[PDB]
């Protein structure tokens, strides 16, 4: 039933108001928390995300963190911002200098606590909890560090439940400091141990897609997180709308990750829009599998598929859309691992997001995605062999021991990659 | 893990207080040690200014002796 969602630091408090603006929208929320819609699809399970209050008000299950208060003025100022309750904003004021030992260890420990009250309040109230979703950065101090503190006391008071992650790997084609590899390297560790999902959202496959595609000299950060809003908006629909399924987290869980420590999964959207040619169904199909819509900068045909989820939202022939899909696959199948068998899965929304007639989206977990953990490890070893920029962390109390196991661990996920690629 | 955490951060604020100690301790040493040189140095030569008015209490009473 209930999901809880949290937002931690820039990036992620970008993203996620970017993605509450498109599912308010979908589901006739206007700014103010009015229902003005005209169909009751959209109200028989709003409650997934967002709770009612008095006079027939809704308002998103949603708390919003940072260690400096910048970006959530910006979001409170922003055009559905008087739509969050005003207790669920919680904020310091010292900041983390892109510093991951300061949002880990530091200055993040001293707000955690008051973090945690405020989930806690909102778990109290959930009829049915069934988990959480988290938004953040892995570049930065405040996402990347006291994101993956909260990942870890989460886990310890709530055990048993879902635990899953949007998150946004840095590239140097779009970079703010040089140790970005080293905050990532230490993030990475953190979600093999404790979450069940991650979305790997790549900032060189946003770039690429912005630049080449639909045509923009200059992408900024915002046409960046309107791809990433409208993947958000594309894998949350099958739990949003009543698509016959009966489906919670964990039974998703169950169908997508073969092996606990391999769950990193590839994102696509099609069609990619910044038109008025409606699509066909082949070309809805030929084009979610193509390595141009993927959202990690990652070769599927590099690697094999493990399992293979697919979204189409919009009116169109169910006969169509399973001929093409198992086309795609009887045509391509070398790419499938064959000790799984029907590992590709497909749902149906009958409800199209805004401006389109007809879309899909694509989760992907495939071995293909080593190559991006390989260019992070590589970053990485370039300055550890020469101990450049560590002064910035030992002098919050780190010891270069802990950064040697963080690049072990992640050169262990490699080679387990590599196992399963070559059976 | 919480322990390994709450180790992290005392080893942080001790680094910070053993910098401060260290750096009291030299500026202390030196601003000491700089005084008493400056003051060995002007009492040597007083001392040797009253060791000329010795030697000319000594001639003047040179000269009433030699009458
Ligand atoms: N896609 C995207 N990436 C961002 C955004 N803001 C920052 N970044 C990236 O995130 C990393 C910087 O982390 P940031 O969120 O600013 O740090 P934090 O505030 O301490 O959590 C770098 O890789 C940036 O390129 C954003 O709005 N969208
Ligand atoms: N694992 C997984 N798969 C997804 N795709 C669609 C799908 C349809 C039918 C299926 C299936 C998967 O698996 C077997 O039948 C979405 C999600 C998700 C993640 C995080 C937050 C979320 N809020 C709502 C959903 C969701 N998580
Ligand atoms: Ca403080
Ligand atoms: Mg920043």
């Known amino acids: ?423 | 893990k919480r322990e390994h955490e709450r180790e992290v951060i005392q080893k942080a604020i001790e680094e910070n207080n053993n910098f401060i100690k260290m750096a009291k301790e030299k500026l202390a040493q030196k601003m000491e040690s700089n005084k008493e040189n400056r003051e060995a140095h002007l009492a040597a030569m007083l001392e040797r200014l009253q060791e000329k008015d010795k030697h000319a209490e000594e001639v003047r009473k040179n000269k009433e002796l030699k009458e």
């Open chain 1, 1 to 423: 039933r209930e999901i809880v969602h949290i937002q931690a630091g820039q990036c992620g408090n970008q993203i996620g108001a970017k993605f509450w603006e498109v599912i308010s929208d979908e589901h006739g929320i206007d700014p103010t928390g009015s229902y003005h819609g005209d169909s009751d699809l959209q109200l028989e399970r709003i409650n997934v995300y967002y709770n009612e209050a008095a006079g027939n008000k809704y308002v998103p299950r949603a708390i919003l963190v940072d260690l400096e208060p910048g970006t959530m003025d910006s979001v409170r100022s922003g055009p559905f911002g008087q739509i969050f309750r005003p207790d669920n904003f919680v904020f310091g004021q010292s900041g983390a200098g892109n510093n991951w030992a300061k949002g880990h260890y530091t200055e993040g420990a001293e707000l955690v606590d008051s973090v945690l009250d405020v989930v806690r309040k909102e778990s109290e109230s959930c009829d049915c909890l069934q988990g959480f979703q988290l938004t953040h950065s892995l570049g930065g101090g405040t996402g990347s560090g006291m994101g993956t503190l909260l990942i870890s006391k989460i886990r310890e008071e709530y055990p048993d439940r879902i635990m899953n992650t949007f998150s946004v790997v840095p590239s140097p084609k779009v970079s703010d400091t040089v140790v970005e590899p080293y905050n990532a390297t230490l993030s990475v560790h953190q979600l093999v141990e404790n979450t069940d999902e991650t979305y790997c959202i790549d900032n060189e496959a946003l770039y690429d897609i912005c630049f080449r595609t639909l045509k923009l000299t200059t992408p900024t950060y915002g046409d960046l997180n309107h791809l990433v809003s409208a993947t958000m908006s594309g894998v949350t629909t099958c739990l949003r709308f009543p698509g016959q399924l009966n489906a919670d987290l964990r039974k998703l869980a169950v169908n997508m990750v073969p092996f606990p420590r391999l769950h990193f999964f590839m994102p696509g959207f099609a069609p990619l829009t910044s038109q008025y040619r409606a699509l066909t169904v082949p070309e809805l199909t030929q084009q979610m599998f193509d390595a141009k819509n993927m959202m990690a900068a990652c070769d599927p045909r590099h690697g094999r598929y493990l399992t293979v989820a697919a979204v189409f939202r919009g009116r169109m022939s169910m006969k169509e859309v399973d001929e093409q899909m198992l086309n795609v696959q009887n045509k391509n199948s070398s790419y499938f691992v064959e000790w799984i068998p029907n590992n590709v899965k497909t749902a149906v929304c009958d409800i199209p997001p805004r401006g389109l007639k007809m879309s899909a989206t694509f989760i992907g977990n495939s071995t293909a995605i080593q190559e991006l953990f390989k260019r992070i490890s590589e970053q990485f070893t370039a300055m550890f062999r020469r101990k450049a920029f560590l002064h910035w962390y030992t002098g919050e109390g780190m010891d270069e021991m802990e950064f040697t196991e963080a690049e072990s661990n992640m050169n262990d996920l490699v080679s387990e990659y590599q196992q399963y690629q070559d059976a």
